[PDB]
Structure 1
Amino acid sequence: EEFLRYLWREYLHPKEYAWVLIAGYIIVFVVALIGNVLVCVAVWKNHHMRTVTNLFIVNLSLAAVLVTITCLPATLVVDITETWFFGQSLCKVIPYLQTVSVSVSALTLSCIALDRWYAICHPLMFKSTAKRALNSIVIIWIVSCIIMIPQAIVMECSTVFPTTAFTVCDERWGGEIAPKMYHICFFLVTYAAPLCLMVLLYLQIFRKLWCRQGIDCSFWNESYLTGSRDERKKSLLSKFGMDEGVTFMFIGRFDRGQKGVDVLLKAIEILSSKKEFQEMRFIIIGKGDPELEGWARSLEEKHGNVKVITEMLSREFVRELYGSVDFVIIPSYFEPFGLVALEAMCLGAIPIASAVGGLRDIITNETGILVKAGDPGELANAILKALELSRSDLSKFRENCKKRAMSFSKQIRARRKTARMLMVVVLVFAICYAPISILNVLKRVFGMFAHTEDRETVYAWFAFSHWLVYANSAANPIIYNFLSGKFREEFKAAFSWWWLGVHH
């Protein structure tokens, strides 16, 4: 009997902290197994839960459950008894299942980051399907099972002689080069390469969702306006020395290939030869390229219905203008995010924008006028069209903008929460696996710990990094409960049906 030999040896390495590691493993085992079963049940029960991101998350809870059941109990025994009580066959299988599950975890988290990046950042904004997500999951298991074959090849149960003897399970390499090169590759494949890729991907996602599209709900509101829009526009034109008329506005830098003021100026030259041009009013707000400023200043001197503002304006002033002008012109060549369109439409201004980038996303047929980018003759026709629309009431058109900009910002706020939760998961994944991955390279790649000063401290750190790996699987369901309202509700429904029979 192996266990009798352990009782005969137990005096040599008595661990008085065994209860703590045991209670910590019992706690993680129940929470990891319970929380991850609900994650599967929540996505498999609710069809509105079956998103690409959640199908990958189910795959994480599947690898999480698979090791919680097959690997955690054996790891608890080994770290406490320093002995392999299971067979030589399980000495290959358990280490294989543990490493495979670490690979399936990392590649799945990397696939979630790619799927978010192609959907949020790439200009095509691909919408992945569930069949595409399932084929990647099948590939992830196949690739993970194949790369971990060499790991099963080298595990070997052997008898150690400290005259009562161990049986231990460990890697057995022929030669001192292969393990060092292998664990360098194990480090890059499981942790360093996937974690770098995710940092680069979520940094672009954060900067776009939080800054480049993060409009201020509370500031850009129509509630800050007073009176009727007619009274504001009339006071607006009176300040600039102009008669009441249909008002167009351009706000942006004076650029060569970017914001398109050169297109607007070319458009104003086209319209200026028509009698209808005397009905329109143009506010052009910006500065930059001196020759464009001199072109806009020259049109302003020529026409009593053009007004150029080169001085800096406060957000409240621009908000007042969005609430008073009839239309806002955005003739950008390049506009990934379209933040000025969301701000204008939130205050009722009607956008006349290039059909590119975020303007093409934001502006619909019912909530603005799109035009081919860089085309002055297209933009002149649109400004002529907007004037024809202005002979009738525009209130239903303005209310469609406000609702469309609100619904679009409502979508950005929903994408922020999902990306924020995914970022917490990868952050906690780097925290949990960092100790074991660093301790594995110091031990296997650099030879540390061989000449031990304090072996008890080193064996204690290894036991901690191990528990921390299983703790990560207990942590993720708790992350979904606190950062996703759809998981938080479906979790509550699973407890009521299980403990009460209540529907939800």
Structure 2
Amino acid sequence: DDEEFLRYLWREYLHPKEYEWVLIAGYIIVFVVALIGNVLVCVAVWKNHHMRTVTNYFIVNLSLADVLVTITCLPATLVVDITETWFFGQSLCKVIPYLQTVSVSVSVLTLSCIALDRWYAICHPLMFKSTAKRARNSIVIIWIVSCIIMIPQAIVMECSTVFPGLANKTTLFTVCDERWGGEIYPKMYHICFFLVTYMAPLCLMVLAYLQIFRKLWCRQGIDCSFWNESYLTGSRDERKKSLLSKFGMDEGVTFMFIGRFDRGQKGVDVLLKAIEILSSKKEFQEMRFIIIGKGDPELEGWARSLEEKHGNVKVITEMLSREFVRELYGSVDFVIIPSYFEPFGLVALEAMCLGAIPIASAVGGLRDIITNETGILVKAGDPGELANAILKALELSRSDLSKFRENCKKRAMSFSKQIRARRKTARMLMVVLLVFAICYLPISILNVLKRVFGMFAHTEDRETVYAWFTFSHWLVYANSAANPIIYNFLSGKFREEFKAAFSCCC
């Protein structure tokens, strides 16, 4: 009667759309999934101390922004897309678009700081001393910048009431939309809006992740299935004696260098000078040197001269197969890596996997790999320091070295594990970036085409354009539901925490 009469009146007022059933269904699904998932992300990182990383701090910030828009903006957007009218008054006409755009800005700047942190950690040779307070300062900056830059958005939003009807106005409708005082202002503002919220951060993040991919996959990594001691037969003593026998050398503490002969990069000049220095001491007779490489013909001549002079020095300018090099690593006592510059100690990791104790310059990746219990670090470029470290290694070799070789093997495996873990994380972040870029493409392009280029002004098919806009709105909100699913599929820690959450209630 009376209650049915009022429902009837709004039905006569509001004209329904044929696709609103799937829109409502999709919004309800995205609402529940985004809410539950992002809440679980937050509680997973907050209640479990193993989740405390800078990346996960940024991920929590992203989930918070997403929860904000899911609770305060998604219902309003659904209602407006269904009814094409603003029922919530003037203040909410300001506030809700402000919250929405602020959350977009927070999201894109959070992804940007994620990309930047990974780039500094991976592509930059240095590392930040601060991790947690760095993330906190970044997050506060992100929110402050986001809230400030979207102030114009809130300023231009206005309620406007339109009175349809020929002569006497019996009905009206209020819309919430941007109010501009000219044709140039919306074009300029929405060009800037597209640049700041979508295009420029996307380009920067794509460049950063290209550099990160190139570093993590093409410039790093060691084939652990090949560089493995399981392929070696017999004990290390037997292999060393067989090696020295085949090389026409007496038994002794065996040092190996492998690399290009150059001046200022791989450091064979430092090694040859250190060998000349050691040649005057009696300990030199207890030592054997295997110098493998090619390059500078003057350094090749110097090395051959040392070989012709000393029976405990052998130089190999021939190209050796990887199986032979693996035999070398698994039988020599020490590998000498006197690089001036060494961004990735690949030789060091390959040698340590096979139990060879590295003696390396403290430069770059060698510093990252080698510790005081897994090798000997020397000042780069100093032949006297290198000779002293070689004498130190001889004195060490007078006793059992097996614990040092085991520490080298464990450290190399652990480093390879870190490399793989960083690869998995970078991959998850790249998927997140790709899904963000897809989810926000339609609305970004449609906003430019409407505001900057003025399309859809006099369109014959306005129903199609309105469907495209409602779809782009929903796709934006579905991004918030998609992120936790991504974390569950591409992160074993998030997956375990989600399983624990869903099991504590079942």
The two structures have a TM-score, normalised by structure 2, of 0.93
Decide whether the 8 Å contact of 1:3 with 1:85 is kept in 2.
no
2:274 & 2:6 partners in 1: Cα distance? 93
Aligned to 1:113: 115
Q: Cα distance, 1:80 vs. partner?
A: 2.1
1:11 & 1:90 partners in 2: Cα distance? 22
SS in 2 for 1:84: coil
Write out per-residue CA displacement over residues 153-172 of structure 1, whole angstroms, 9 at most, x where no aligned residue. 00111124668543211111
Query: Is the alpha carbon distance of 1:99 and 1:432 closer, same or farther for their aligned partners in structure 2, counting shifts above 3 Å?
Result: same
Query: Is the alpha carbon distance of 1:75 and 1:354 closer, same or farther for their aligned partners in structure 2, counting shifts above 3 Å?
Result: same
2:10 & 2:400 partners in 1: Cα distance? 94
Query: Is the alpha carbon distance of 1:232 and 1:453 closer, same or farther for their aligned partners in structure 2, counting shifts above 3 Å?
Result: farther
Decide whether the 8 Å contact of 1:260 with 1:374 is kept in 2.
yes
Identify which range, 210-219 or 92-101, moves more after superposition. 210-219
Task: Find the partner of 1:457 among 451, 464, 472.
Answer: 464
Query: Is the alpha carbon distance of 1:415 and 1:2 closer, same or farther for their aligned partners in structure 2, counting shifts above 3 Å?
Result: farther
Aligned to 2:343: 336
Decide whether the 8 Å contact of 1:212 with 1:339 is kept in 2.
no
Query: Is the alpha carbon distance of 1:127 and 1:205 closer, same or farther for their aligned partners in structure 2, counting shifts above 3 Å?
Result: farther
Query: Is the alpha carbon distance of 1:8 and 1:491 closer, same or farther for their aligned partners in structure 2, counting shifts above 3 Å?
Result: closer
Task: Find the partner of 1:314 among 310, 321, 330.
Answer: 321
Identify which range, 68-77 or 44-53, moves more after superposition. 44-53
Q: Cα distance, 1:289 vs. partner?
A: 2.1
Query: Is the alpha carbon distance of 1:312 and 1:10 closer, same or farther for their aligned partners in structure 2, counting shifts above 3 Å?
Result: farther
1:292 & 1:41 partners in 2: Cα distance? 61
1:10 & 1:198 partners in 2: Cα distance? 50
Write out per-residue CA displacement over residues 53-82 of structure 1, whole angstroms, 9 at most, x where no aligned residue. 212111111110111111111111222222
Query: Is the alpha carbon distance of 1:41 and 1:12 closer, same or farther for their aligned partners in structure 2, counting shifts above 3 Å?
Result: closer
SS in 2 for 1:213: coil
Decide whether the 8 Å contact of 1:157 with 1:167 is kept in 2.
yes
Query: Is the alpha carbon distance of 1:455 and 1:383 closer, same or farther for their aligned partners in structure 2, counting shifts above 3 Å?
Result: same
Query: Is the alpha carbon distance of 1:293 and 1:5 closer, same or farther for their aligned partners in structure 2, counting shifts above 3 Å?
Result: farther
Decide whether the 8 Å contact of 1:480 with 1:488 is kept in 2.
yes
Q: Cα distance, 1:314 vs. partner?
A: 2.2
Identify which range, 346-355 or 453-462, moves more after superposition. 453-462
Q: Cα distance, 1:448 vs. partner?
A: 2.4
Task: Find the partner of 1:164 among 163, 166, 171.
Answer: 171
Query: Is the alpha carbon distance of 1:78 and 1:4 closer, same or farther for their aligned partners in structure 2, counting shifts above 3 Å?
Result: farther
Write out per-residue CA displacement over residues 473-499 of structure 1, whole angstroms, 9 at most, x where no aligned residue. 001111111111221122122223xxx
Decide whether the 8 Å contact of 1:259 with 1:333 is kept in 2.
yes
2:40 & 2:68 partners in 1: Cα distance? 14
Q: Cα distance, 1:187 vs. partner?
A: 1.4
* 2:386 pairs with 1:379: yes
The two structures have a TM-score, normalised by structure 1, of 0.93
Q: Cα distance, 1:300 vs. partner?
A: 2.2
Query: Is the alpha carbon distance of 1:168 and 1:272 closer, same or farther for their aligned partners in structure 2, counting shifts above 3 Å?
Result: same
Decide whether the 8 Å contact of 1:246 with 1:390 is kept in 2.
yes
Query: Is the alpha carbon distance of 1:261 and 1:10 closer, same or farther for their aligned partners in structure 2, counting shifts above 3 Å?
Result: farther
Query: Is the alpha carbon distance of 1:446 and 1:123 closer, same or farther for their aligned partners in structure 2, counting shifts above 3 Å?
Result: same
Query: Is the alpha carbon distance of 1:131 and 1:3 closer, same or farther for their aligned partners in structure 2, counting shifts above 3 Å?
Result: farther
Query: Is the alpha carbon distance of 1:6 and 1:63 closer, same or farther for their aligned partners in structure 2, counting shifts above 3 Å?
Result: farther
Identify which range, 88-97 or 383-392, moves more after superposition. 383-392
1:311 & 1:6 partners in 2: Cα distance? 92
SS in 1 for 2:191: helix
Decide whether the 8 Å contact of 1:8 with 1:164 is kept in 2.
no
Q: Cα distance, 1:379 vs. partner?
A: 0.7
Q: Cα distance, 1:9 vs. partner?
A: 9.2
Write out per-residue CA displacement over residues 263-317 of structure 1, whole angstroms, 9 at most, x where no aligned residue. 1111112112223222221111111222222222222222222222223222222
2:5 & 2:319 partners in 1: Cα distance? 81
Q: Cα distance, 1:414 vs. partner?
A: 2.0
1:3 & 1:55 partners in 2: Cα distance? 52
Q: Cα distance, 1:92 vs. partner?
A: 0.8
Query: Is the alpha carbon distance of 1:420 and 1:2 closer, same or farther for their aligned partners in structure 2, counting shifts above 3 Å?
Result: farther
* 2:78 pairs with 1:76: yes
Identify which range, 450-459 or 4-13, moves more after superposition. 4-13
Q: Percent identity?
A: 98
Decide whether the 8 Å contact of 1:52 with 1:128 is kept in 2.
no
- Which sections of structure 1, spanning at least 5 residues, go unmatched? 497-504
SS in 2 for 1:122: coil
Q: Cα distance, 1:11 vs. partner?
A: 9.4
Query: Is the alpha carbon distance of 1:256 and 1:461 closer, same or farther for their aligned partners in structure 2, counting shifts above 3 Å?
Result: farther
Query: Is the alpha carbon distance of 1:313 and 1:461 closer, same or farther for their aligned partners in structure 2, counting shifts above 3 Å?
Result: farther
Q: Cα distance, 1:6 vs. partner?
A: 11
1:383 & 1:265 partners in 2: Cα distance? 12
Q: Cα distance, 1:196 vs. partner?
A: 1.9
Decide whether the 8 Å contact of 1:282 with 1:307 is kept in 2.
yes
2:15 & 2:129 partners in 1: Cα distance? 57
Write out per-residue CA displacement over residues 452-473 of structure 1, whole angstroms, 9 at most, x where no aligned residue. 2432222222111111100000
Decide whether the 8 Å contact of 1:209 with 1:412 is kept in 2.
yes
1:154 & 1:475 partners in 2: Cα distance? 31
Decide whether the 8 Å contact of 1:103 with 1:190 is kept in 2.
yes
SS in 1 for 2:162: coil
Q: Cα distance, 1:129 vs. partner?
A: 3.3
Decide whether the 8 Å contact of 2:16 with 2:83 is kept in 1.
no
1:219 & 1:461 partners in 2: Cα distance? 53
Identify which range, 158-167 or 77-86, moves more after superposition. 158-167
Decide whether the 8 Å contact of 2:344 with 2:364 is kept in 1.
yes
1:19 & 1:117 partners in 2: Cα distance? 45
Identify which range, 63-72 or 268-277, moves more after superposition. 268-277
SS in 2 for 1:159: strand
In the comparison of the two structures, how many residue pairs are matched?
A: 496
SS in 1 for 2:80: helix
Q: Cα distance, 1:432 vs. partner?
A: 0.8
SS in 2 for 1:308: strand
Write out per-residue CA displacement over residues 308-359 of structure 1, whole angstroms, 9 at most, x where no aligned residue. 2223222222111110111101011111221211110010001010011111
Q: Cα distance, 1:8 vs. partner?
A: 7.8
2:4 & 2:476 partners in 1: Cα distance? 28
1:115 & 1:124 partners in 2: Cα distance? 12
Q: Cα distance, 1:4 vs. partner?
A: 8.4
Decide whether the 8 Å contact of 1:38 with 1:494 is kept in 2.
yes
Query: Is the alpha carbon distance of 1:15 and 1:164 closer, same or farther for their aligned partners in structure 2, counting shifts above 3 Å?
Result: same
Aligned to 1:499: none
SS in 1 for 2:50: coil
Decide whether the 8 Å contact of 1:33 with 1:65 is kept in 2.
yes
Identify which range, 148-157 or 171-180, moves more after superposition. 171-180
Decide whether the 8 Å contact of 2:16 with 2:82 is kept in 1.
no
Query: What is the RMSD of the two structures over their aligned residues, measured on CA atoms?
Result: 2.4
Query: Is the alpha carbon distance of 1:156 and 1:382 closer, same or farther for their aligned partners in structure 2, counting shifts above 3 Å?
Result: same
SS in 2 for 1:451: coil
Identify which range, 393-402 or 26-35, moves more after superposition. 393-402
Identify which range, 347-356 or 277-286, moves more after superposition. 277-286
Alignment of 1:55-66 (within 5 A): 55-66=57-68
Identify which range, 201-210 or 457-466, moves more after superposition. 201-210
Write out per-residue CA displacement over residues 165-196 of structure 1, whole angstroms, 9 at most, x where no aligned residue. 43211111111111111112111211222222
Query: Is the alpha carbon distance of 1:161 and 1:313 closer, same or farther for their aligned partners in structure 2, counting shifts above 3 Å?
Result: farther
Identify which range, 230-239 or 171-180, moves more after superposition. 230-239
1:209 & 1:350 partners in 2: Cα distance? 25
Decide whether the 8 Å contact of 2:106 with 2:142 is kept in 1.
yes
Write out per-residue CA displacement over residues 344-394 of structure 1, whole angstroms, 9 at most, x where no aligned residue. 001000101001111112111111111000111111111111112222221
Write out per-residue CA displacement over residues 140-163 of structure 1, whole angstroms, 9 at most, x where no aligned residue. 212111110100000111124668
